[PDB]
Amino acid sequence: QMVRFIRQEAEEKANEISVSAEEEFNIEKLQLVEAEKKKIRQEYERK
Amino acid sequence: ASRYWVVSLPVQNSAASVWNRLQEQISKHSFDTPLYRFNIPNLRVGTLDSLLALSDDLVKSNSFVESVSHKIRRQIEELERVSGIESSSLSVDGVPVDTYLTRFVWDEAKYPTMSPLREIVDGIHTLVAKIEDDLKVRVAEYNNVRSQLNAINRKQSGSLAVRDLSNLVKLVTLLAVVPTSYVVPRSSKLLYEDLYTVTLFGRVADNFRIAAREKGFQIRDFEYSSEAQESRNQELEKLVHDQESLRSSLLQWCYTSYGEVFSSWMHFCAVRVFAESILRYGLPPSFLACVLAPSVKGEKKVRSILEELCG
Question: Which terminus of chain A has fewer Cβ atoms in its 10 Å neighbourhood, N or C?
Answer without folding.
Answer: C
